[PDB]
RNA sequence: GAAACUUAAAACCGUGUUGCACUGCAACCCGGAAUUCUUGCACGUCG
């Protein structure tokens, strides 16, 4: 509500442009069969990371999960 | 003139729906704004 009049025009606010003009959507993954056509087994990888110490270096572990870099999503939005 | 009840007996009673027809109805978005984000070397030590 303190943004520009061009950002508060297509995104909403609660002062004078009460509704969007832009409708975003949720997006599922689409190319699942194209990923198992190649050599991909799981849709999400598991990545191990480290945090080293800058003196007498000892490290503690954490595990991160993320979507693989071959994925494709069906982007869409409406304008009124 | 003094002396002998226009008295006795007789229900203002019997029968009869405050009843018949009638929508608490028509019109109205629990709606508008908001990133599950910020920092982090799978690494150190070798008779």
UniProtKB/TrEMBL annotation:
<comment type="subunit">
    <text>Part of the Csm effector complex that includes Cas10, Csm2, Csm3, Csm4 and Csm5.</text>
</comment>
<comment type="similarity">
    <text>Belongs to the CRISPR-associated Csm3 family.</text>
</comment>
<protein>
    <recommendedName>
        <fullName>CRISPR system Cms endoribonuclease Csm3</fullName>
    </recommendedName>
</protein>
């Amino acid at each position: 509500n303190e943004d520009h009049a061009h950002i508060r025009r297509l995104f909403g606010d609660t002062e004078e442009y009460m509704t969007g003009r832009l409708v975003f959507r949720d997006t599922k993954l689409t190319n699942k069969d194209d990923l198992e056509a190649r050599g991909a087994k799981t849709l999400t990888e598991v990545k191990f990371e480290n945090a080293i110490n800058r003196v007498t270096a000892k490290a503690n572990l954490r595990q991160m999960e993320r979507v693989i870099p071959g994925s494709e999503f069906a982007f869409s939005l409406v304008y009124e």
